[PDB]
Design a protein that fits this description.
This is part of a larger assembly, with one copy of chain A (about 60 residues), two copies of chain B (about 160 residues), one copy of chain D (about 170 residues), one copy of chain E (about 160 residues) and six copies of chain F (about 160 residues).
Chain B: H1 2-11, H2 18-43, H3 45-59, H4 73-96, H5 100-106, H6 110-115, H7 121-138, H8 141-158
Helix pairs in contact in B: 2-4, 3-4, 3-7, 4-5, 4-8, 7-8
Chain E: H1 2-12, H2 19-44, H3 47-60, H4 74-96, H5 101-107, H6 111-116, H7 122-136, H8 142-159
Helix pairs in contact in E: 2-4, 3-4, 3-7, 4-5, 7-8
Chain F: H1 3-12, H2 20-45, H3 47-59, H4 74-97, H5 101-106, H6 111-117, H7 122-140, H8 142-159
Helix pairs in contact in F: 1-2, 2-4, 3-4, 3-7, 4-8, 7-8
The complex binds phycocyanobilin (CYC) (8 copies).
One phycocyanobilin sits at the interface of chains C and H.
Main location (chain A): membrane
Subcellular location (chain A): Cellular thylakoid membrane
Membrane topology (chain A): Peripheral membrane protein
Amino acid sequence: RLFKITALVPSLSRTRTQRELQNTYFTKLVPYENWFREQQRIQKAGGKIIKVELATGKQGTNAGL
Amino acid sequence: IVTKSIVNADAEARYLSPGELDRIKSFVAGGQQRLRIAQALTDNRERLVKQAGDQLFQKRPDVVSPGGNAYGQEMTATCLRDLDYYLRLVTYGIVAGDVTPIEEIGVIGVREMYKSLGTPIEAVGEGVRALKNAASTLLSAEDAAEAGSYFDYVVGALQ
Amino acid sequence: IVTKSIVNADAEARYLSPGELDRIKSFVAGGQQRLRIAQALTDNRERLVKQAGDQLFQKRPDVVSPGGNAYGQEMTATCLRDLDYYLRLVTYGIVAGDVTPIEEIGVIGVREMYKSLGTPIEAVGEGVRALKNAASTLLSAEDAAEAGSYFDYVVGALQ
Amino acid sequence: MRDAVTSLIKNYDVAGRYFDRNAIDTLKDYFDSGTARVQAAAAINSNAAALVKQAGSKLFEELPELIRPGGNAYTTRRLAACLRDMDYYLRYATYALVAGNTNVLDERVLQGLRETYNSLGVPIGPTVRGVQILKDLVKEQVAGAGIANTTFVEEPFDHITRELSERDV
Amino acid sequence: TVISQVILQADDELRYPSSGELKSISDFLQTGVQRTRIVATLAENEKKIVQEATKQLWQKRPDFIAPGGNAYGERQRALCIRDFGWYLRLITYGVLAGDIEPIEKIGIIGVREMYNSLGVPVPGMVEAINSLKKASLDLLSSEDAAAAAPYFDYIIQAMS
Amino acid sequence: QDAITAVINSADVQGKYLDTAALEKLKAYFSTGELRVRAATTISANAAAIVKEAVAKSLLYSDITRPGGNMYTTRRYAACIRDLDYYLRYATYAMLAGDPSILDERVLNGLKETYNSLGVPVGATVQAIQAIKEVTASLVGADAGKEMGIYLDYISSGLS
Amino acid sequence: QDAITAVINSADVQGKYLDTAALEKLKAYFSTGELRVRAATTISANAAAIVKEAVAKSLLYSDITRPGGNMYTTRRYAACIRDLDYYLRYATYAMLAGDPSILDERVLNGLKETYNSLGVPVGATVQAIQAIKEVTASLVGADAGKEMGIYLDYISSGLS
Amino acid sequence: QDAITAVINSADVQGKYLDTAALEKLKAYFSTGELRVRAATTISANAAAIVKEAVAKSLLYSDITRPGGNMYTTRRYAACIRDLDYYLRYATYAMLAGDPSILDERVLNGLKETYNSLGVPVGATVQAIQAIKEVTASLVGADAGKEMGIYLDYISSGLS
Amino acid sequence: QDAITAVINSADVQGKYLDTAALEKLKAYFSTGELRVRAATTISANAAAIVKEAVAKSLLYSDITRPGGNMYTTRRYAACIRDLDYYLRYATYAMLAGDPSILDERVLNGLKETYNSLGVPVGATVQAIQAIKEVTASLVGADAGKEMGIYLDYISSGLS
Amino acid sequence: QDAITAVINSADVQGKYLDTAALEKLKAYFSTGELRVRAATTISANAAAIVKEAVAKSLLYSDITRPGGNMYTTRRYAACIRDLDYYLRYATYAMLAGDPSILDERVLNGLKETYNSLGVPVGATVQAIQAIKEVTASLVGADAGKEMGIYLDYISSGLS
Amino acid sequence: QDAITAVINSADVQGKYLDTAALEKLKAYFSTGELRVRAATTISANAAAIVKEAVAKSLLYSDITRPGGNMYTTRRYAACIRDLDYYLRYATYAMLAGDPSILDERVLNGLKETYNSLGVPVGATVQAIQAIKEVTASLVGADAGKEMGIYLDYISSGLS
Ligand SMILES: *[C@H](C)[C@H]1/C(=C/c2[nH]c(/C=C3N=C(/C=C4\NC(=O)C(CC)=C4C)C(C)=C\3CCC(=O)O)c(CCC(=O)O)c2C)NC(=O)[C@@H]1C
Ligand SMILES: *[C@H](C)[C@H]1/C(=C/c2[nH]c(/C=C3N=C(/C=C4\NC(=O)C(CC)=C4C)C(C)=C\3CCC(=O)O)c(CCC(=O)O)c2C)NC(=O)[C@@H]1C
Ligand SMILES: CCC1=C(C)/C(=C/C2=NC(=C\c3[nH]c(/C=C4\NC(=O)[C@H](C)[C@H]4CC)c(C)c3CCC(=O)O)/C(CCC(=O)O)=C2C)NC1=O
Ligand SMILES: CCC1=C(C)/C(=C/C2=NC(=C\c3[nH]c(/C=C4\NC(=O)[C@H](C)[C@H]4CC)c(C)c3CCC(=O)O)/C(CCC(=O)O)=C2C)NC1=O
Ligand SMILES: CCC1=C(C)/C(=C/C2=NC(=C\c3[nH]c(/C=C4\NC(=O)[C@H](C)[C@H]4CC)c(C)c3CCC(=O)O)/C(CCC(=O)O)=C2C)NC1=O
Ligand SMILES: CCC1=C(C)/C(=C/C2=NC(=C\c3[nH]c(/C=C4\NC(=O)[C@H](C)[C@H]4CC)c(C)c3CCC(=O)O)/C(CCC(=O)O)=C2C)NC1=O
Ligand SMILES: CCC1=C(C)/C(=C/C2=NC(=C\c3[nH]c(/C=C4\NC(=O)[C@H](C)[C@H]4CC)c(C)c3CCC(=O)O)/C(CCC(=O)O)=C2C)NC1=O
Ligand SMILES: CCC1=C(C)/C(=C/C2=NC(=C\c3[nH]c(/C=C4\NC(=O)[C@H](C)[C@H]4CC)c(C)c3CCC(=O)O)/C(CCC(=O)O)=C2C)NC1=O
């Protein structure tokens, strides 16, 4: 059970740390019980969540994931 | 048990090692005894729920007491329905040969569910112990051992 | 509350922002009322433990019942000693102004302790509620509000 | 890290007893000292960045070898590090001023100080020397804006000294 | 402000807000009406404050008026006028607000990288806001002045 | 964001000083903060009892907890309790801030995407949030229950 | 998923006990597991020989390995061998599970997206999987080659 | 390591083939594996009851749980339960492996360093492991309780 | 990629040896590398002066640095300087490589997505890159300013 | 070390002469030395009575002097009296020096190691030192009992 | 150990007789022993002058001999001279043995433990050993100064 998420997290603190200023827009797969804290961490930075999509998993199935 | 070996060899980049193929062949051999044990627990369900409610309400009378959760006919019917659910999941685990399709439906989030329902989990563990005792009386020795296996897993899981 | 602002501004590389200095000055101003509330809860402890045991054993008689944990004089003495401990931690939190030195000693690992002692946590929460009611009867309105603050934190923590 | 109110709570918690009269006496002491402590910390916070510069100036007035060949504040690359250490000592001294203890200086400053300073070849004598240029200046600034008794301003710099101290008696 | 602090904390650690923090909330709510009256006073006469501030600047440092300086030229001369008013607008917003961080976010985060490749020097900004501080606490009542001084000297140290 | 921070932002993007309407808004917030803090305290008291009463009102003994329903598996029941605790906690944060922006930023951002991905029924969630709102409006009183129900209905309306 | 796990799931979502048709399905699986295990063993014997014979049958000496083709570069030849080894290995897993869901979950999920992104020819891949199927049906026998060809044709049909 | 892996290693470092004494060792292990597995199952049944009974036997109502003792704070009580659960779980692993090397590799490596760093009393830990050993030897029987007590006494002897 | 690596790749995917047209391309690159290196050196000299002059030409004293504009907040001014330094640095890399593929791979990949997500104005960015191009074409000369303006106009055209 | 020697050391490691703050510290010590000497005399009067009253307050008629306790054997009772006499005597030395360094150097150095090696209960020792502190604060007065209780609580805090 | 004893040991642990490579090693040692003995004699001549010149080169007139430094107290200056005399003497022993094992066995065993326990600065010790090495390489010549500097750099590298 994996999700395909596109998201965008600006740190808002690169100007006082002088970091690499790398890209903040990604399309990644995340597993089932992991997307929970990923959701939460992306919302911690005020990040926009563009689109959540099912990669792996049939919904409504109970045994066998 | 085939999904266990498949995801086990799937995390690695290797194939299924032939010792795992030996354990799959042995489980395939024992599947007929597994099916007979599951059918014997299947057809005699209401006896097992009756004797489990018997031994539980003899053991812990607080669910019977009005401060407890299983007070009244509706709540005691929900209680025996929970015991029916756990017997059903035990038959699933008996067929599957490994405790994954029973833990996925009955174990993995049970503590917070029973905590936010008010019921104690130790009484549920005693109920599954009573189910194990009644199925041990119902089956033969090599069948009661192999049933008390998965019943033992549920009793350890609810605690 | 000074350690809270200090580690709060210490995770940052900045100094203590002067709004935090304002809250420290206001806590410094209210410290005299805090000390009077703590001394009033201090000298009247055995009344509060008596009325808390009163209201708890009237509310939940299963600790009195022999299946429960607090059965017999020794176990009920340990029960009232636990309530004495929680009243002591509430006075610590009343002086400190913020719930850190009471959560560090009474909250942070209490669920697994009471689980491996056999006692239910809801009865302990009802005991701290009875302590809050007795201290609300003991104090004035603006004192009972500020005591029921930290008592309310303990009641929310034990659940 | 323990406050002046939480250190009493630890001392009374290890014995398992309640508050008595003596702890209430020291809490009354801390609670009438707090209004003066906040004002002293605001006065030191206000002019802190210039305090660091004058502390550097008098520190180089004292020992010439600090800004010479065989010293540690030679280039600006090695000068900015000494000045930010002045910044650090002043910052945690203000932290210990509002806390009222020396446990912040113990737990966050002094605990690994010998290891870094012996590791980087950094001296210790000129460091405590600079700490006390800082506290003379800070005493002047606290005495400027009001506050008459300045011994609580006086103590945390000296505690930093006594633990950075290479004790020979 | 304080509600930002308590809410970001209590969310960051997955609990409800503690009660000492709620007591800090309501003593901030009582302190707010004096905050409203002092920010109304500073919104009354900002003209005098920026006029004093520019005047004390051009008494303090003569190199901005000398050619080759930053106040030389009519455009940037007219600009520094409103720049002073921007900083005291941020001071009014801050002296109302319980914390300096929503004002730190607006005008304090990247000061060095901004003014550094802009032309103006950061050793002049501390004299600018020193003149603004002198011109604000002459125009207020005494303990209000003592309450609004730390926001000024916060911006002063955040420059240099 | 706050109500304070929203007022400061709305005054800031115009370059406007704090006029009397903004001071009215801040003084109304400083008036209502009393019952805001008291309501947040008593909601933080018994959040588990509120969630238990809400599922006993709306979701229990339906087909949803029967097999075939979305709350049949016990991990799904635990996830249901987690989601309802989230709705109540973030509604408490939005009630104490006095501004629903944290609901838009932290809860309602990508939530319909998730609930249509997992096959979570939306109408049963809306009825569960409604039962939450009725239980906490009974528990806290009508006067703070109005402001609690505003943000809970905000979550319910954005979810639909 | 398994065939066992699929039967248990189909009995579970109805709340149904294990009726006689499900027991027939499980007993048919327990009958066929013998040749399933023997076929998986001899396919795990010589997978490299199967992939070598398949590329020698279908892909070699074409324009695909000539310059301009997609298998001209030697890293692309190694990637081709990797993809064919993946198809054979996951077809072995789906043959031993007796359920093609792992092909849908682990192989056929985002594969047409990748092969149209990289410009990989799809028809040559389908013919290579066909040559894989012919070689392993010759190697294992007809009786297990049918079940191997079912999942290899499942990969080929989902790829197209 | 195993007992099997230890026998294979001892035969390997000599370059020796499997002689009859090593086959005797492996056949003795294959004889004892029955009660090894049954003992591991019933110890995995009620590990929490074993730890509860052990602290009720040895550590409770002493000065250790009184203030001044090392188990006074509730996080320290939880850490005590964690350490006893670790001792029981790794003793179960060493019982099923039939070789105490995993105790030496995973538990007894830097444990006296930690317990003398934190000020943890060692003798009370030894008596708690002794009470664990008595409870599980009563619970599992004498015949597997001997092998359980061997590895628990190994932990106790290495701790001292 | 390079111009050398692009020529080698275009000769490789045909299986072609290095014919005379590819040798002409490589010898033209080896002729132009002199002024390429000298231009890269003097652009690496004073990149901060180029960015300062470009914002003073295009972005300063507009509504963009006024409140309401996207460069009002000082962290947003620092982010603007950061983005312009990125454009100049990657244009220097593409000028010295003689191939704009690194602009397509490292800058222009997901940049319109980011600038439409944040609400960054695109036309002001294009005019700022234009002012960058005019300043560096004045600073380096016309002969290398043509090749610098080619890649800066490549960034400007891909951005639009 | 002394308070005098600590002041001299803190002035020495800086190379500093004796400034006025150090002279204030030494003059405060020379003021307090009167009651320091009088307190040390009356504590040296009846140390055996203090230890007797402390064990009669805290340790006697408990389970500690019963069989099974750590003070059951009469050599262990004599060792208990010896340890309490040590705590009182070294607290007298630290009171007269005005500096707790001799407690750190001579008592608290390896004491938790010894008390965890022998199985000595730590909490009962802390309560015995507390009873010592109460008895000597009653015996000497409050004004010197504060300074006696500071070093006795130092021993109690370092022991825990 | 020696170089002779190391050669004999390396031939012994194989059970090997003295082959020609070991005889080459022993004959090279018997060739170099002339200058080894002459170097050891002239280093034993004036060891105090070498230590005096080394502290005058490296450690004197620094902050280390000033108050606050580790060589301020005169017993610490005497301990410094003792440690440098130890380094020179054991380097002489390792030079005459031709094997650095006595440095590993007698000097470098627990020396970093001691120097981090006492707070001895390690880098100043390394620079003092470096000044020792330069002085004795000047005094003895280059040809034996190489072998002296090898063991002194061995002490310096093991110390760091
Ligand atoms: C002024 C017209 C002339 C001048 C004067 C000057 N310099 C200082 C102080 C310092 N100078 C340094 C210098 C450097 N650090 C480096 O890394 C390098 C690179 C090689 C240099 C040149 C430092 C570290 C200081 C501070 C310590 C010190 O006093 O030396 C002063 C004193 C300023 C004061 O009182 O604070 C003065 C008057 N230097 C020039 O460039 C002009 C020729
Ligand atoms: C200045 C008064 C003295 C001096 C200072 C000096 N320090 C350094 C380097 C470092 N100093 C620290 C110090 C601290 N880190 C902490 O976390 C704390 C507590 C909050 C302190 C006090 C650290 C970590 C460094 C390493 C650099 C870094 O921060 O990563 C130097 C540089 C040494 C060098 O040569 O590079 C100097 C010069 N030197 C003096 O001469 C004064 C006596
Ligand atoms: C197959 C996986 C599965 C589990 C585990 C499960 C548990 C479950 N137990 C419930 C109630 C209940 N469960 C019990 C339980 C007990 N009686 C006692 O005293 C003992 C503690 C225990 C059983 C002997 C009681 C008394 C109720 C009714 C409680 C109430 O109405 O609040 C409910 C809510 C009512 C319902 O919809 O049935 C659920 C969902 N449901 C599931 O689908
Ligand atoms: C200050 C922090 C702190 C806490 C929280 C604490 C709890 C604590 N409660 C205990 C026992 C106990 N606690 C209770 C509790 C209760 N009676 C009930 O029925 C209710 C559920 C509840 C109180 C009203 C009981 C009955 C026992 C005895 C249980 C037993 O003997 O097994 C014990 C073991 C015996 C002891 O050493 O006192 C500890 C350590 N100790 C601490 O130092
Ligand atoms: C809200 C926080 C904030 C502020 C206040 C701010 C100011 C600001 N000052 C600017 C320029 C400037 N600012 C100054 C400032 C000064 N000259 C002096 O001598 C004095 C020391 C000082 C104050 C009067 C000068 C001279 C310029 C012109 C630089 C140039 O264009 O050459 C500019 C660029 C041109 C413009 O858009 O006007 C901005 C955006 N930006 C911000 O984000
Ligand atoms: C703070 C805002 C926020 C929310 C709400 C949130 C929800 C959320 N709910 C989830 C699942 C779930 N959510 C529900 C909830 C429901 N289904 C029903 O039938 C009811 C109508 C409703 C409960 C009232 C259930 C049953 C699942 C389980 C699906 C599964 O995990 O198999 C998941 C998938 C992974 C996981 O729980 O750990 C997320 C991320 N995440 C967030 O960050
Ligand atoms: C798998 C092998 C293994 C062990 C055993 C282990 C132990 C261990 N025990 C610890 C603490 C502790 N350990 C104890 C245990 C005891 N103190 C007593 O009084 C009793 C005699 C004894 C319990 C039977 C206590 C009370 C602490 C708390 C100290 C503290 O955290 O403040 C800590 C410090 C940090 C932490 O718990 O999370 C470690 C690492 N780690 C390991 O990896
Ligand atoms: C190497 C290629 C590359 C680019 C360009 C890049 C841009 C980039 N610009 C950003 C923000 C920004 N970008 C701008 C830039 C502008 N807005 C304007 O008004 C002007 C027209 C323009 C400046 C010329 C501003 C003002 C922000 C601030 C938005 C914010 O952080 O609140 C962000 C959000 C997070 C952050 O800065 O740290 C990214 C990722 N990342 C990359 O990897």
